Amino acid sequence: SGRLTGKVALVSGGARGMGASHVRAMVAEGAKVVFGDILDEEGKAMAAELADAARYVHLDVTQPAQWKAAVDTAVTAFGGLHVLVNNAGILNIGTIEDYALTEWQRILDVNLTGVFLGIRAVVKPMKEAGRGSIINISSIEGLAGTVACHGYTATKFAVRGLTKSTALELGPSGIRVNSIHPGLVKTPMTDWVPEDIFQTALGRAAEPVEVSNLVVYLASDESSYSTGAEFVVDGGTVAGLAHN
Amino acid sequence: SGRLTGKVALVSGGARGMGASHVRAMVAEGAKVVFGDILDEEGKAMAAELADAARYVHLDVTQPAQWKAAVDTAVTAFGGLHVLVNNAGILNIGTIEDYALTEWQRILDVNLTGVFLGIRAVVKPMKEAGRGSIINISSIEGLAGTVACHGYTATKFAVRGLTKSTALELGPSGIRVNSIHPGLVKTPMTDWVPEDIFQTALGRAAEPVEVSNLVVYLASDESSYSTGAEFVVDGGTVAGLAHN
Amino acid sequence: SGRLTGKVALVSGGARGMGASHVRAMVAEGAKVVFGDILDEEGKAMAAELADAARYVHLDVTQPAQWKAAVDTAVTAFGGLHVLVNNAGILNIGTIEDYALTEWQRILDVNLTGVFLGIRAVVKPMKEAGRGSIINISSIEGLAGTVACHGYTATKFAVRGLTKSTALELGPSGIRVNSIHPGLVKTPMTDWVPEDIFQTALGRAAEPVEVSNLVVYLASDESSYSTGAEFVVDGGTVAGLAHN
Amino acid sequence: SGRLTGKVALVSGGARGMGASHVRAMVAEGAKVVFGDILDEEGKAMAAELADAARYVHLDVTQPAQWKAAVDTAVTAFGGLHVLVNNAGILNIGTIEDYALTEWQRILDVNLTGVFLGIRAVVKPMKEAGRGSIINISSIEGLAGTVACHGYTATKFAVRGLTKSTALELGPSGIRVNSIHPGLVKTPMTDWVPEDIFQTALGRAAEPVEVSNLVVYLASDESSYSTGAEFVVDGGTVAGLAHN
Ligand SMILES: NC(=O)c1ccc[n+]([C@@H]2O[C@H](COP(=O)([O-])OP(=O)(O)OC[C@H]3O[C@@H](n4cnc5c(N)ncnc54)[C@H](O)[C@@H]3O)[C@@H](O)[C@H]2O)c1
Ligand SMILES: NC(=O)c1ccc[n+]([C@@H]2O[C@H](COP(=O)([O-])OP(=O)(O)OC[C@H]3O[C@@H](n4cnc5c(N)ncnc54)[C@H](O)[C@@H]3O)[C@@H](O)[C@H]2O)c1
């Protein structure tokens, strides 16, 4: 408790799923949170329960003008911005032949370009404060491949890399950038996926808050000497070899 | 020798630099090679001195229709297509703030989408033959980040990932997919870069043929059990820690 | 505050350096701690200031008999054991030609075998509890190589691997196993090394507590979905490429 | 092909399995080979059918005296030594509790220490010719973990790390050091393991010659710019995520 007191955060895709969980988890730790999404109804609903500790803003991560407005909201409403959780994302699938180029561009736009636009938007106020933490949501798909999951895999691997280059550049400014790589988590993005799809050591899928606990750690000053690194939260899947 | 005798390859960005070196190396090994680029003048000159062993085609890797045409050329002129070297690529630099969104889009288009488009085009002929080897040129920049190199890092990491997902999917078809990660190689892309810019164990930059040797190996059947893997040829850079 | 309440831990090599920091940090979070070492004077000294929540024990990690005694102490004194921090370790250097084979054997004994012995000694009480967290101290030297640092490098890579095998096996029992990889940290092991020997994004060496924060997080149930994973805390070093 | 014509190689554990395969392949590629093992009968037998190009010696990789004897045999009989294939290794298994401490020590001595002893023994003759290729045999178990396979996993990870530390140190002398990581390979070490035990993209286990082709490539000058790197030949296992 109070581990994020004094900190202001911006969470992309915070209307439902893990994003919503991160928003609630950080507020519970004393942070003021601005969260954006395209699901206005849902966003305005939780904005009501959170009250003065949060602010919902419509934010299409592929739109730089919208990122700017979301950032202006945080600075003005809460006095500044110290944390960015690039959580917004989508999932599409298809074989090398059946996957539509439009689906490919679309996922590149949201999962990759959107993360980059988030970073470009938050660097000024973060650099002014002298201390910031950027948390990019990748996945274990950003560590290994999956059949018929080319666009998703390509972008999650891309985010993994963007984390490293930006961490290196922003380090001197007092800004840390790390990537989170989870296994299967219970959210609307995977409710159609069997919960034991991956071979985990823990024998179960993850609850969103289990990833939020990691978001809180990386957002806090507790992880002050960690940057440009991959934090895996997958129940052990990537720790072992794929066995039949 | 004839390490590639009987094989047909398609090399993007083969008008100069490493690509050109790959084309010459494979032809020397008995392979028939169709190489494409946007530098037609230089490309045609090469085709001239390579006579029947090769064909130059104009190929902008961001254009799917051009990939289709390149593949048709390889099939009609040589009867098949067994190897693809996704070598075409560009490098642009810039800090998070100064970097142009147009530079970012263009590098994603060339280095990432272009690689995916090549794969899409070569799978029909390869799948019908029941074998093939796709070689994606990533870089050690696809293994770690670099200051003001966000567009390049992100795409090289993405290529690294795409290699894995496509390899898992194409395995059952008898097609292998691997990624090559070279360090500094002497080519026009880096002639403005100091040869000893990386901390290497060998104490020198790479000659383009040294990477071509790796291309020939992955293209030949002597790498029949390797797929979805990263083959590093950087003189030892990523094997060590960045010291001051 | 109380993030580790009700948890009993065992820290090897906790008489000074990071080990001591870990003891202090965890006690501050409500944990009862038994810590062993071979520096009895220093061990008894700090055990005096933490007398109510901690217990010192002489423990040579190469001696399984001493590991068992360290465990019985934790179980009888505090009622059980839920956390193990395999922190004890040594550093020796030397070229391939001059490195003494006795030094090589010695470092494998302490740094590697010692880690495995600890795990063997804590699994029973942990399984009996149905919940536990094993934290193995590797290093960035366990992620890449270093000249004249063969024994340390090999052992640190070995810990990284042992972390994974034991994690997969212990997962079904409710026990998580992870490894920490820090960069240069200010401790007596490094008093002789310039604080800026590594190329870091943060431009400074680490403070032992900065690593203890990670130990705290991995010891708590907050990291419940993380097992078999590598947690890097190196100021960004391995995130970039080694430059001259 | 005469791909290794003129080079002299020393192979440990070459009396059967992959070791024998490597010997035969290298000799077939025009190389002179000195291969050691503890199975003298089998060693002397295949040395009789290779005669004009190979020399079998008794070599227990745990004894530096025998390593020195093997090395001197290569030099005196073939005039030098340019290639070392650290192939000797053993496999034992057991859960954290049942695993005998004697099995742990034994596999450390043979799998890790033996590899190190091999390197120590060959550097002098390689440093005189300012050229050398050291090929250490790791495994995909040196990349991820396996239940009840702690000694094996640890040592294979250790070999992976030792490869990098030594490569960095030997680079200035023109000596390359790389590690090979194969998946399931049909040899007497795993004739009790179902061939489809691993999730591969290729849908089969490897023939030992498929790994030998990789040893030849690394032994050849065609890999001149690769050192301290990991060469995976596992049919795709590690490129994918463990599924159920
Ligand atoms: N669900 C999983 O198992 C899992 C595993 C690893 C990683 N992830 C990643 O975690 C993130 C969140 O996943 P989730 O499980 O909550 O999925 P989700 O579908 O529940 O939520 C994603 C959210 O992003 C929002 N969003 C989508 N496109 C957007 C855009 N252009 N602009 C702004 N917001 C947009 C969606 O409306 C939604 O609220 C994604 O990056 C996802 O790839 C999920
Ligand atoms: N030079 C290095 O040190 C180094 C290190 C690692 C990786 N690489 C990679 O190797 C590849 C070749 O690099 P290089 O060093 O020879 O660079 P290069 O500039 O000499 O050659 C790249 C080639 O790609 C062609 N090309 C560019 N855009 C294209 C497009 N849209 N369609 C088709 N062709 C296009 C260029 O005209 C050129 O002939 C690139 O993917 C590069 O990123 C280079």
Ligand SMILES: NC(=O)c1ccc[n+]([C@@H]2O[C@H](COP(=O)([O-])OP(=O)(O)OC[C@H]3O[C@@H](n4cnc5c(N)ncnc54)[C@H](O)[C@@H]3O)[C@@H](O)[C@H]2O)c1
């Ligand atoms: N100092 C660094 O920069 C750094 C970086 C990465 C990892 N590490 C690791 O962190 C751990 C602790 O490092 P440190 O910096 O505090 O070193 P340190 O020398 O201060 O402490 C190591 C401790 O282990 C104890 N010890 C040594 N041999 C032992 C044995 N056989 N049995 C029991 N205890 C034994 C020592 O007496 C000492 O208290 C080690 O595993 C080290 O490899 C240190």
Ligand SMILES: NC(=O)c1ccc[n+]([C@@H]2O[C@H](COP(=O)([O-])OP(=O)(O)OC[C@H]3O[C@@H](n4cnc5c(N)ncnc54)[C@H](O)[C@@H]3O)[C@@H](O)[C@H]2O)c1
């Ligand atoms: N079989 C596989 O699937 C597989 C997969 C990855 C890695 N490997 C590795 O490849 C190497 C060879 O494996 P293999 O499949 O041929 O096993 P193998 O049992 O057939 O051969 C290993 C050889 O090493 C020799 N040897 C054992 N201890 C020795 C010692 N102390 N001194 C000298 N020689 C000794 C044995 O007599 C034997 O001929 C080992 O390092 C093994 O761990 C094997």
